[PDB]
Design a protein around this ligand. Structure first.
Ligand SMILES: [Mg+2]
Lengths: 165, 178
RNA sequence: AAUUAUUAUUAUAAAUAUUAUUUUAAAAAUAUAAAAAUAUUGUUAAUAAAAUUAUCAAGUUUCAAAAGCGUUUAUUAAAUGCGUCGGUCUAAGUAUUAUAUUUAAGAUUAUUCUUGUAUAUAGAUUUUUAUUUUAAUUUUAUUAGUAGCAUAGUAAUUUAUUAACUGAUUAUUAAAGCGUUCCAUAGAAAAUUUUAAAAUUAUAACAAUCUAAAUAAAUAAUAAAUUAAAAUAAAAAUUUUAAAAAAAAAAAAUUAAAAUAGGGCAAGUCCUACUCUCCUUUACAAAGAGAACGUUUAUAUGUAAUUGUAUGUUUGAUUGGGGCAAUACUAUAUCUAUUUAUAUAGAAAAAGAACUAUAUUUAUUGAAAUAAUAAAAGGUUCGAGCAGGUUAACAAGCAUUAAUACUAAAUGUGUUUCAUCGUCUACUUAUUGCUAAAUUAUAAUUGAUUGUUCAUCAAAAAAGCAAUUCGUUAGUUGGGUUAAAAUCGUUGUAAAGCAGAUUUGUUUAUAUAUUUAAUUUUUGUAUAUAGUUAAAAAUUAAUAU
RNA sequence: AAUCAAAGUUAUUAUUAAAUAAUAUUGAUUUUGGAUGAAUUUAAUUUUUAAUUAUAUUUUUGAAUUUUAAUUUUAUUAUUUUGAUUUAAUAUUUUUAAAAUAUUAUAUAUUUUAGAUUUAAAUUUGUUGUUUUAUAUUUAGUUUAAUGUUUAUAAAUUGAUAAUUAAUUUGUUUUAUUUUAAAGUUUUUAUGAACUGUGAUUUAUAGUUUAUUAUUUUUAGUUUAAUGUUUAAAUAUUUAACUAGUGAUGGCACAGUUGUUCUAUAUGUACCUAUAAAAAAUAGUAAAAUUAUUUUAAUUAAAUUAAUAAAUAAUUAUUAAACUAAUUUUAUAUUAAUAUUAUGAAAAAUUUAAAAAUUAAUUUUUUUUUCUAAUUUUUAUAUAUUGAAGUAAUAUGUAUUGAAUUGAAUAUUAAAAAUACAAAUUUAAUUUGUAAUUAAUAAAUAUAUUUUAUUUUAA
């Protein structure tokens, strides 16, 4: 019927968890133009100190620092790329966290544990399902504009309605 | 053709016997199956003597008993002593004291009815061993019939080939093969 | 003519020279055929133009198709040739003439209609059809028509034959014959009838000439062999290997018995052709010379022009950048869309910008078989594939490889297939292959087979018909069209001159029937009637120490 | 019968070849004309028998390139009088021409038999020894400089002017080479019309049918067929056919981008692709080759692109490098610089596809010093005891329905009962008559073990 081109490799250009300069493409994402239509949703949305390039959806860090992926607590399909700027802040803990757990003195319930995050949130915020599932009535989503002039509410944000946690 | 070293067998391909079997995988070739193994397989073990000891003479994989149960015949003559080093000093009757004994057993073997014309023959060969050690085995006969010719070619230098300087003696001494 | 060779060098002349180069004790083939009863085409693609003869060497007849008698490198509806006709030419040849062509003579006729070349033309192109060239796709009237006529087919009918893929007849919408048609037609090629010497089937049937040995001493080919046999499995292949397991001369089954044709692919070159590419180009037109004629220009570009392109990938479509299909992707399967066409000359002169190319983007048209070729490998016919036979099992366009076409002749073979037990049919048409169908009754199925034999088919510009092509040409159909070397190894048939004698065991080309009669029991059984056998027929016998 | 491994020396004879060398040169191999000349003529403003010290420029963007070197100055066209010198080469003919070891029923040379077997090269695009070359002997047989010692010094930059605090080597100037054999071609001019075309060329040496001078034809050289098939022949023997030429084998005449053509792309001297001559055309883009044993660091890769593979990654290679936490006191081939004519991966595990394999896949992808030692072996277990066949009248009942008929055994219908015998055989129906839910334990392994093809040593 026709031909086809080869699908390019859209994968990580750093190692997640390790330090990162800004001139490194953190991930070269598929601007999933389904077939060069103009609407896509990238796999790894941008995170802390990470800024997305508009054209090719490639995440470039903005400040040199250790990098990481934060899988969304709600849906583990939607991930952010966090770059936390301090490289010593994590290195000087890893060298402990990996020196403690060698002597068998580190606890495995750490937040950073991959398989614990499901339970970690639930120890602290026990009804977080209901805090994101709750549907807001159009009254409270647009709090009385007079409360903005009377100054009660610091600033009305009517479009920020979605709980991205 | 992509002629690159490391793309196949380096220079061409050869089928040595360690390949025609045990190919890549150990099965190993599709053609050149292999030669049939025409060695001499050892024979299976004789039956042990009946038990009549009640010492569990039947047990095979036990600590006490060496596997072989050979209590054959004038084995009691092979009365062994314990040395100092842990060795053993086996005192056996000499090769003459046996053939001279064998004559006695054999000479009273066929005489009951009639010693055959071959029975008279054997006691001669036996009585020929005690006296002269007239040897009958190939390993010496195969050796002596040759070693003589080989050493007489030396005493009388029947070489015809005096050069033979270990390059020409290279093929020879390996075109022979023992 | 490579020679002291096939070989009267035929310019002449002549006619009674006892002029002077040819081994030899056999049968196979083979070259070849004296002789000889029947049979007459059943052989075959097809008998009949097939040497000489003192036995004096000759087939007759009918029908259909088919011109001139000359002439040709694959030898003929090839190309000639007379006439008619079309065009040209009155300052080099006679305009009832000679140039330049198309046809073909003889006899009937020679239809309908035009889009382009040519002519005429008026600055040229563009326009434009008295005659001519080429055309007519439903020209298609005359005329013949299954025909060298694109398939459909063996056309349907009739004959003819025991059997009609023959051939001839009738008509007749023939895939798209067609007025240069059609008829008439002789020696040719068919089809009958018929007769007949070639040794045509049946059928086999040596009279002739073609020794060994002695002598002289070349050729193809040659990696080796002590393996070569034989059987079985294989794994890429036809099998050949590997392995196991065995155990002298004729013929051509294998080795390469062949040469050399037959393919198709790759890069290279060749040669031919035309509306689209391009020079050297001699023609047409302009201008310049008081134009006395030769030159130079400008504008033009002609297949008359001999240059180069005419692809690549999957098989005929596709060429882009994405995406979904295990962050595999052959093109796999689906879809999308400002996803963008780099450079160089031109275009935009500040920082800003346009055009176009198989969208990585190097070149300046598209087509052919030219008997295409040269240097290579690699297949059509296969250890595996594909599409059109009663729907479905089957002819068989791609993964090997001097195996170098189907069929026939001859000559074998291992299988397998119901109750003994089993497998010999010959013909007609066409040589395609396989059926139809005639002989009362009618050939089991697989497999390996054909260099020994033919060539019928399939087949390489020799043509031609319809058919596709702008052309060169392409594909159906018919007539044509070399088909071949001294046998070394294996193999096998024989043999080794031997023998007062078949044989212990090996191992077996050698095996009684498959073209049906008359007996006799036709009774048993039931609407007709069996069964052992015998005679006759198919007419021939078989032992290495 | 069968084998059996096997002879290295002729003998005798003497002034070429090749390059080089910068002095001559009107055409080398008899005696022109021999009437008296007309007949023995090669000349013209072009890389020419004239042969030229640079890397910058400039240029259809890409095969195009540097100007006197000292003005007659020596780079200039060359031998007899050292067998003319030198260095390389070396013969060629005459006639020489040699030799005594392995069985006795068969695999292949070792003496002691048995063990033993790709013949090589290429080709293998692992369609993995893929059907190619080699008779043998000897001779001849293929060109990328493996090195930097004192005079002596280099090194960048803008588009351009310019700017050059911009940081720094090396070099008495290093250049030259680039495989080997092989086409069809292709262009440049010389030869050929004795073969054969066509032009032109012969005006009556046999037979015959018919009235006919036209016309049937004797017809021994020629449309066929056999033989021959490196043949007596690079076309002959025998033979069929044909044969009537006042219009033709033939005076000489036409020549190669062209002659001739009664036209076949045919022939023009035994393949018309004319011969002959002169080139280095291209051939790496699956042609054939590419010459020197005993060595001393490993591997594959598979992506961007292609009017479809000389180019790129990645690999490999040559040369060279520096020791960044991670652990043992383990273990690690990572790189730079250059050189690079490549598109497809066994057995698996799966995945597309009528595949009938191709495709994706991704781990393989063999070079034995010698004596010796060794743990993986063409040896593994296979379904029966029992043709239970005697032992008895019956009774809602031959239910009902459908049915010609049916009574447990036509058809459909199936949970009724009571005193047990309705999924059949049997009969046109029934009765009779077969039949009466039973002993029949393969399981208990058989040899397990030992013992054999690769785990070491010594030299
Ligand atoms: Mg040599």
């Amino acid at each position: 019927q026709a031909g086809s081109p080869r699908q390019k490799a859209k994968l990580f250009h750093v190692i997640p968890g390790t330090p990162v300069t800004p001139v490194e493409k953190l991930k070269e994402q598929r601007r999933r133009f389904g077939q060069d239509r103009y609407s896509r949703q990238p796999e790894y949305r941008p995170g802390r100190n990470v800024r997305m390039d508009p054209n090719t959806f490639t995440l470039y860090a903005t400040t040199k620092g250790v990098m990481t992926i934060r899988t969304s607590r709600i849906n583990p399909s939607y991930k952010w790329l966090d770059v936390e700027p301090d490289i010593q802040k994590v290195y000087r803990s890893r060298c402990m966290r990996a020196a403690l757990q060698a002597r068998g003195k580190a606890s495995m319930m750490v937040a950073g544990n991959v398989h614990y995050r499901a339970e970690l949130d639930h120890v602290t915020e026990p009804h977080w399902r209901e805090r994101v599932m709750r549907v807001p009535k159009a009254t409270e989503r647009f709090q009385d504009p007079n409360y903005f002039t009377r100054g009660l509410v610091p600033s009305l944000r009517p479009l920020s309605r979605y709980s991205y946690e | 053709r992509a002629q690159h070293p490391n793309a196949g067998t380096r220079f061409g391909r050869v089928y040595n016997r360690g390949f025609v079997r045990y190919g890549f995988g150990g099965f190993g070739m599709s053609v050149y199956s292999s030669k049939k193994d025409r060695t001499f397989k050892v024979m299976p073990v004789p039956p042990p003597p009946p038990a009549t000891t009640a010492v569990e003479q039947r047990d095979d994989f036990a600590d006490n008993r060496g596997l072989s149960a050979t209590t054959r015949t004038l084995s009691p003559t092979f009365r062994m002593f314990a040395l100092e080093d842990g060795g053993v000093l086996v005192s056996h009757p000499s090769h003459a004291q046996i053939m001279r004994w064998n004559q006695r057993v054999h000479t009273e073997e066929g005489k009951a009815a009639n010693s055959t014309v071959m029975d008279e023959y054997v006691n001669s060969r036996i009585q020929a061993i005690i006296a002269d050690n007239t040897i009958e085995n190939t390993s010496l006969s195969q050796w002596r019939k040759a070693h003589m010719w080989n050493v007489i070619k030396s005493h009388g230098k029947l070489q015809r080939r005096w050069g033979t300087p270990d390059f020409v003696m290279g093929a020879r001494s390996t075109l022979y093969n023992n």
